[PDB]
Design a protein around this ligand. Structure first.
Ligand SMILES: [Mg+2]
Ligand SMILES: [Mg+2]
Ligand SMILES: [Zn+2]
Lengths: 150, 129, 184, 87, 206, 82
RNA sequence: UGUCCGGUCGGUUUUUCAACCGGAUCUUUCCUUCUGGCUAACCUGUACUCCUUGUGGGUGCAGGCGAACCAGGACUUUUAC
């Protein structure tokens, strides 16, 4: 019921019944893949790409039409970033928080938030390590965090 | 987290029975759960039950007969060494005569009597009396 | 093209099917072309309980897509050709079984090939360009699994009369008793 | 219950509620026997012939009782249009 | 099972409509009641009529099934329907209770008004509630005339009806009486509006 | 809702009322509104909850402004359903 | 094991029946696989008949069903229960 806050909501995407294609909504799988690749090249993250596909074009999910997801496709092509997207975002957030703290020494809530973010990042990092995406003996923290980010 | 899905289901069923409902809706719907339900049916504690295919995990509906009294689930799946079975039964079930202690084992998910007949016990799941 | 577009061709029924296909091709706008990129792995015959009969014609699987891209018209043609019998362009699926604890690792199975999965795939195939909304499965008091298929109310013109036959076919394939249903 | 070879032991073999199945106890002061007279053609309620229903007390207490009764009636064939299967 | 004869006569339906047995209930609504037939907008609910009729019939049948007639204890506290209740009692010999119920009537075997029913009948389980409770102490069936905001705890065979009141309750009572008469009695036919009148019942001018 | 609901088949109204999640099967009630702009004669399969400043296929016309839920279709624009 | 008679000199042997616990298999199905030892067996058919009018029955050996056992590889997903 949420990781960090005490807010237990279900703001959530439903997903339709048919694993098979929504008949009429046409195009091609290959075309979709190409589009995704292009997006990746441009700079759009997998989620972003998916959103784009949903909004203007007739795509519902890549999982449906291609068979494969988006991240997987990117990997196959050679386009998934070194740091996975969510993790990267988290890191960025942490960095921002750190910066804010530096700017304004006296700020307790902010500090707490930063700490929380860091913890989250650590968790994520650990998970990644367990999986085998990010190589082991590697902490994504604070001083080098900035460097990692940019 | 949703720990012991089966346990949750059992609890729900119990609640329904207490209420005086004629039927229950169960969310997760496992293999183990299904087995348990089947066992219950065999014994004579439950009507029809139907697995909905949420193109996903599962979702069961059970027809309650008004015969169930408790449909319990023991917590960690304790390792039962055949002689201990009797003890377990004594602890849980009312009367030497009737009721069952649904325990998984090598052979399958079965009641205590069945296990005895087989000559094969294992880890407990629940009970029905 | 008699004993050619059939992967391995021994039987009379298969030959007949081939002949029919050839005849169909005789037309030749795109149908012929489609036929040229289509074959059968084998054919299997199911006796439906009530006069009619069912033809589970097995397809490789890579050609399944091609069949689908045509299918309905082709199916209709086949029906016209061979009276008193329904046709199902079914897929020949493998079913590499579950390995035991002691048994040998055949470099793992795919979950595409798992028995249940295979069955599901077959079901999907067999019911036409119509699409399943969902499935109930009823476990009855005696102890009989009865699958109950909810069909999507759009179209439902091809399936309408074939439901029993389809069920029979499914039973033959698997053993499970299927039933069909349509919501309002 | 059944000693040796039949010989039914244990008297007072209880009324079980129509709606719930739930045993109606000896001092279940709330539980009720409804008697519904048997219908015939053109008036006529057939003297000395009923569909008898037992309702347990719990149900009555709840207020789920009337509905249950209605359902039972529907099942029997004492009503039409009243109790629907789905709500 | 059923005769398939009594399918609610048109005239009866009309009468009911006039009474506004089915324009009652209002905004307020109970989860144990599916006797509605479409919500009329802004502070209204419309009641399904056929269902009500069926319920009434059932109640009548139940009443008939009681053999000893001086037994069907009709009750009414609230003023609009007392008269109706009295009328009903007069029609079909079963000692009623107009006005005050007296607690310890069905229990408490010393009381002057110690009834002992085998079938209780009520108008408003919101008001007569006490009576219902009393009945529940000693194993008696309860028939009652539910508005869709009235509680149905220890109630059976709840005839749905408008308990704003005035015409409606009385009308319902009359209908019930008629039904009772039909099921074993003088009246052998569902047809003929007959020598009685609805307006024998109803609340009177004080 | 009491005792004997008979839970496999509800009336559709109930389903509609309940959360897009809290029915029998999960099924969304968002739609691919096939929008036509006033300019070019071409149809954009616009998902009703855009989350984006939805341009046309090429021309910078602006079809739908993404409000938190369903998108407000910018100006006098015409649309088909799904 | 209850049944159906004790078919029997209070005990025993089948059938009319039973539930219960296995085993082999066939079902889109491998139970670990082979390099060889024994191939028990007939899937056999080489002479066809000791012989009630017969597919009741076996002296009998080139192709060859191996589970009837070994004796060695190959390598075992590993546990817990
Ligand atoms: Mg939650
Ligand atoms: Mg925490
Ligand atoms: Zn344009």
């Amino acid at each position: 019921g949420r990781m960090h806050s005490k807010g237990k909501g279900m703001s959530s995407s439903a997903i339709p019944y048919s694993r098979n294609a929504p008949a009429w909504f046409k195009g091609s799988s290959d075309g979709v893949v190409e589009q995704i690749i292009k997006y990746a090249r441009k700079g759009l993250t997998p989620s972003q790409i998916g959103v784009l596909l949903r909004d203007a074009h007739g795509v519902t999910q890549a999982k449906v039409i291609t068979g494969n997801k988006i991240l997987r496709i990117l990997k196959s092509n050679g386009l998934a970033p070194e740091i996975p997207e969510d993790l990267y975002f988290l890191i960025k957030k942490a960095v921002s928080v750190r910066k804010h703290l530096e700017r304004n020494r006296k700020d307790k809530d902010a500090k707490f938030r930063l700490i929380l973010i860091e913890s989250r990042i650590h968790r994520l990092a650990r998970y990644y390590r367990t999986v085998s995406v990010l190589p082991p003996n590697w902490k994504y923290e604070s001083a080098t965090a900035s460097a990692l980010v940019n | 987290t949703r720990t012991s899905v089966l346990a949750d289901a059992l609890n729900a069923i119990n609640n329904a029975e207490k209420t005086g409902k004629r039927q229950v809706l169960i969310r997760p719907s496992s293999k183990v759960i299904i087995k348990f339900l089947q066992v219950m049916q065999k014994h004579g504690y439950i009507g029809e039950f139907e697995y909905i295919d949420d193109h996903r995990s599962g979702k069961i509906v059970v027809q309650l007969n008004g015969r169930l009294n408790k449909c319990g689930v023991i917590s960690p799946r304790f390792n039962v060494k055949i002689a201990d079975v009797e003890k377990w039964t004594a602890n849980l079930l009312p009367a030497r005569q009737f009721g069952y202690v649904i325990l998984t084992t090598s052979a399958g998910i079965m009641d205590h009597e069945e296990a005895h007949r087989k000559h094969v016990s294992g880890k407990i799941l629940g009970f029905v009396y | 093209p008699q004993a050619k577009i059939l992967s391995q061709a021994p039987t009379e029924l298969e030959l007949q099917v081939a002949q029919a296909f050839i005849d169909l091709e005789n037309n030749s706008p795109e149908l012929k072309a489609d036929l040229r990129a289509l074959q059968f792995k084998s054919i299997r015959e199911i006796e439906v309980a009530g006069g009619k009969k069912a033809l589970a014609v097995f397809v490789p699987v890579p050609s399944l897509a091609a069949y689908h891209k045509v299918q309905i018209k082709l199916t209709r043609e086949l029906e016209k050709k061979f009276q008193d019998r329904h046709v199902i362009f079914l897929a020949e699926r493998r079913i590499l079984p579950k390995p035991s604890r002691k048994s040998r690792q055949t470099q793992k199975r795919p979950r595409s090939r798992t028995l249940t999965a295979v069955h599901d795939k077959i079901l999907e195939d067999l019911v036409f360009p119509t699409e399943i909304v969902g499935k109930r499965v009823r476990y009855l008091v005696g102890g009989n699994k009865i699958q109950k298929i909810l069909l999507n109310s759009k179209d439902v013109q091809h399936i309408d009369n074939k439901l029993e036959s389809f069920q029979a076919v499914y039973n033959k394939l698997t053993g499970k008793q299927i039933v069909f249903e349509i919501p309002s | 219950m059944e000693n040796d070879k039949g010989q039914l032991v244990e008297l007072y073999v209880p009324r079980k509620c129509s709606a719930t199945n739930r045993i109606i106890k000896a001092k279940d002061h709330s539980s009720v026997q409804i008697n519904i007279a048997q219908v015939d053609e053109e008036g006529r309620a057939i003297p000395g012939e009923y569909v008898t229903y037992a309702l347990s007390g719990y149900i009555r207490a709840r207020g789920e009782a009337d509905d249950s009764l209605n359902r039972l009636a529907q099942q029997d064939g004492l009503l039409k249009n009243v109790w629907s299967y789905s709500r | 099972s059923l005769p398939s004869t009594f399918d609610l006569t048109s005239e009866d339906a009309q009468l009911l409509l006039a009474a506004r047995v089915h324009l009652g209930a209002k905004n307020v609504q109970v989860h144990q009641e599916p006797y509605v037939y479409k919500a009329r907008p802004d502070g209204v609910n419309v009641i399904n009529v056929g269902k009500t009729w069926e319920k009434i019939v059932l109640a009548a049948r139940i009443i008939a099934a009681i053999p000893n007639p001086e037994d069907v204890v009709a009750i009414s506290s609230r003023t609009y329907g007392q008269r109706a209740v009295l009328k009903y009692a007069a029609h079909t010999g079963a000692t009623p209770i107009a006005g005050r119920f007296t607690p310890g009537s069905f229990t408490n075997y010393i009381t002057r008004s110690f009834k002992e029913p085998r079938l209780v009948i009520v108008t408003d389980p919101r008001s007569d509630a006490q009576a219902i409770k009393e009945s529940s102490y000693v194993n008696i069936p309860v028939i009652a005339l539910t508005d869709l905001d009235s509680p149905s705890e220890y109630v059976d065979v709840a005839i749905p009806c408008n308990n704003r009141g005035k015409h409606s309750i009385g009308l319902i009572w009359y209908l019930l009486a008629r039904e009772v008469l039909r099921l074993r009695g003088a009246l052998p036919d569902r047809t003929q509006p007959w020598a009685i009148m609805p307006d024998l019942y109803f609340y009177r001018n004080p | 809702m009491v005792l004997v609901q008979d839970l496999l088949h509800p009336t559709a109204a109930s389903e509609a009322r309940k959360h897009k999640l809290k029915t029998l099967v999960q099924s969304p009630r968002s739609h691919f509104l096939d929008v036509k702009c006033p300019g070019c004669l071409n149809i954009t399969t616009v998902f009703s909850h855009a989350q984006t400043a939805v341009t046309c296929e090429s021309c910078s016309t602006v079809l739908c402004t993404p409000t938190g839920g369903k998108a407000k279709l910018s100006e006098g624009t015409s649309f088909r359903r799904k």
